[PDB]
Design a protein around this ligand. Structure first.
Ligand code: HEM
Ligand SMILES: *[C@@H]1O[C@H](CO)[C@@H](O)[C@H](O)[C@H]1NC(C)=O
Ligand SMILES: *[C@@H]1O[C@H](CO)[C@@H](O)[C@H](O)[C@H]1NC(C)=O
Ligand SMILES: *[C@@H]1O[C@H](CO)[C@@H](O)[C@H](O)[C@H]1NC(C)=O
Ligand SMILES: *[C@@H]1O[C@H](CO)[C@@H](O)[C@H](O)[C@H]1NC(C)=O
Ligand SMILES: [Ca+2]
Length: 595
């Protein structure tokens, strides 16, 4: 029932528990156990992992091994039969902007990243996974079912490499395999500043004592800053247009350029830092770089917490917001702030909120040029469409005046992600994010749908008609029963997402519970939570309480018309007001008085 353990990274970290600043790595957040929520450690297990062999092998690995006496369906077959749809007509969320989806991905990137095995090597390039589609040792290919179009076109499988685990080792025996969280479990803008000393410093402008983040030297946006390029090869952002040869951006998080609207929101977050620093500098010119960096980082960290907890979670969790995140009653050092393995899958509800197209809008919020609208698949790892096609202003306008996809039991994930996903090194727009989510559920040893239903104190359907009642959908139930045979065997990603949405929310009860718990814990278990007595002065928090995503945009673009409520569905001009009408961030209470 208890063991001793193994040590993955640098075992301890001298803490210096005077420092008023979060570490970069998240270490020293918790004084009793300083490793808690620190990056490059095991994700938390809320339930024991479930592997084919009890230890490490995913359900589905060995054909003759059942789960509860039934074969596990191929991930792509589940994708084709349940997740797919043809008709993008009527699929849009009438009361969520496209920024709703985007903030989800941003928060996600702040909280969890489980890299595939050895990010310190490409070896052993035999290759062979993508070529000969042969299973072995952390090559776990997604095999196509009979009658899959991709059969005809792409080969027998989509490549897939198993997630890294502690101890940071390929061969492992004894205990249950535990995947790594490579970012800080704390909601702390790690996606802007990084989660390792190494990347934190490379991101900084040290060359001047102003505590600024590095900016693009090779290009600019009407004088406004771009993130610096990653001059790493092979650059997938170069690969998607070898003519344009415009590389990926360098950010606190390595997924920053995965799509143009994530790269965009990263660009906004960086500018805010530099803006915040330059402001602080003026008020307090006696402050060195370090002090400005940290004080800006600290304010940026709060902005993310507040937009997340005050604006985003209430319209994800809906009725269930109070049940799982009651109002803040201060830091609790007994709460475990770590991101759970299951969260990293629950948060992929976002994938059903991504629509098929992205718009560039002009100052009249009307089509920017004759190619205003682009398919999402052409915008993966696409930086050149920012740099040479009007910078971020047209793209941010689209985040405001366009809609998220609405999650839909007959229209789950757009074919832009479900058939055309680009993965670096693999050359084609030919991958499936849904199939990858399911394979990854199994990779991570996820307990099934009913285990998690029991965890959240909810009924555990055993029959078709039981599942019909919970999904409130005869035909979706029937397809799942036909593929999985028992609700116990349904992968949590698709089980969770199949449930109809709670009142005023965008996730069902199961996900509401799994998400709500995690957000509760990263808040209550955070020493540096913005509302914690002593982190911010009482006046500093009256200033922070007024930030909005509407304000972030006004201060960091040349956009002069915004909604007040950026996550709601907003039509121009009826729901738009001038940037003048929007509460500003008053940095008065940061005025420091000394020698
Ligand atoms: C165009 C939009 C998006 C794209 C292209 C995208 C793509 C991806 C990809 C490629 C992965 C890694 C897949 C794997 O290896 O298992 C991933 C993981 C993930 N995505 Fe998305 N995603 C998008 C939007 C979102 C949104 C909106 C959310 C949430 C609101 C979200 C949440 C996540 C989470 C939680 C993970 C797991 C991260 C980890 O811990 O490793 N994504 N996404
Ligand atoms: C660092 O700051 C100075 C302005 O103080 C600027 O001219 C220089 O380009 C900056 N370097 C980077 C890479 O951001
Ligand atoms: C590559 O970018 C150039 C301009 O840099 C553009 O005119 C051209 O159409 C692009 N081609 C593709 C396939 O994106
Ligand atoms: C902190 O949380 C734990 C459960 O995680 C609970 O037992 C306790 O009531 C909380 N402690 C305080 C002092 O509120
Ligand atoms: C839009 O968002 C929230 C609830 O989802 C609420 O404040 C408002 O009434 C909603 N408006 C609608 C559904 O038109
Ligand atoms: Ca973080």
């Amino acid at each position: 029932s208890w063991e001793v353990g193994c040590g993955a990274p640098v075992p301890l970290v001298k803490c210096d528990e005077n420092s008023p600043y979060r570490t970069i790595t998240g270490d020293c957040n918790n004084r009793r156990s300083p490793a808690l929520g620190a990056a490059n450690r095991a994700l938390a297990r809320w339930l024991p992992a479930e592997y084919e062999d009890g230890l490490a092998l995913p359900f589905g690995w060995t054909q003759r091994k059942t789960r509860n006496g039934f074969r596990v369906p191929l991930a792509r077959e589940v994708s084709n039969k349940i997740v797919g749809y043809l008709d993008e007509e009527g699929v849009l969320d009438q009361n969520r902007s496209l920024l709703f989806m985007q903030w989800g991905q941003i928060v996600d990137h702040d909280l969890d990243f489980a890299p595939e095995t050895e990010l310190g090597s490409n070896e052993h390039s035999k290759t062979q996974c993508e070529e000969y589609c042969i299973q072995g040792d952390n090559c776990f290919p997604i095999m196509f079912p009979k009658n899959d179009p991709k059969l005809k076109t792409q080969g027998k499988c989509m490549p897939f490499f198993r997630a890294g685990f502690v101890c940071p080792t390929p061969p492992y025996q004894s205990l249950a395999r535990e995947q790594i969280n490579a970012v800080t479990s704390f909601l702390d803008a790690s996606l802007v500043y990084g989660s390792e000393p190494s990347l934190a410093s490379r991101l900084r402008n040290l060359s001047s004592p102003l505590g600024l983040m590095a900016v693009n030297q090779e290009a600019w946006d009407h004088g406004l800053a771009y993130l610096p390029f990653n001059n790493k090869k092979p650059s997938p952002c170069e690969f998607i247009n070898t003519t344009a040869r415009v590389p990926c951006f360098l950010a606190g998080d390595f997924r920053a350029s995965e799509q143009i609207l994530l790269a965009t929101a990263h660009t906004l977050l960086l500018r805010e830092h530099n803006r915040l620093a330059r402001e602080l500098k003026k008020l307090n010119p006696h402050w060195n770089g370090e002090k400005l960096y940290q004080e800006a980082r600290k304010i940026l960290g709060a902005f993310i917490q507040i937009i997340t907890f005050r604006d985003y979670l209430p319209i994800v969790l809906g009725s269930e917001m109070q049940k799982w995140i009651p109002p803040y009653q201060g830091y609790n050092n007994s709460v475990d702030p770590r991101i759970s393995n299951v969260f990293t899958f629950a948060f992929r509800f976002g994938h059903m909120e991504v629509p098929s197209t992205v718009s560039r809008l002009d100052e009249n919020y009307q089509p920017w040029g004759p190619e205003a609208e682009l398919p999402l698949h052409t915008l993966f790892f696409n930086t050149w469409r920012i740099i040479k096609d009007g910078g971020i202003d047209p793209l941010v306008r689209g985040l405001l005046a366009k809609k998220s996809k609405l999650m839909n039991q007959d229209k789950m994930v757009t074919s832009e992600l479900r058939n055309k996903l680009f993965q670096p090194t693999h050359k084609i727009h030919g991958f499936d994010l849904a199939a990858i989510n399911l394979q990854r559920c199994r990779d991570h040893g996820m307990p099934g749908y009913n285990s998690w239903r029991g965890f959240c104190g909810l009924s555990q359907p055993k029959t078709l008609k039981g599942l019909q009642t919970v999904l409130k959908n005869k035909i979706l139930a029937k397809k799942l029963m036909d593929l999985y045979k028992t609700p116990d065997n349904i992968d949590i990603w698709i089980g969770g997402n199949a449930e109809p949405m709670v009142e005023r929310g965008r996730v069902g009860p199961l996900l509401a519970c799994l998400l709500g718990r995690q957000f509760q814990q990263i808040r209550d278990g955070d020493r540096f939570w913005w509302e914690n007595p002593g982190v911010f002065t009482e006046k500093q928090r009256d200033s922070l309480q007024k930030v909005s995503f509407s304000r972030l945009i006004c201060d960091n673009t040349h956009i002069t018309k915004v909604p007040l409520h950026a996550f709601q569905a907003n039509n121009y001009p009826h729901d738009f007001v001038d940037c003048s009408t929007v509460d500003k961030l008053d940095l008065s209470p940061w005025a420091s008085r000394e020698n």
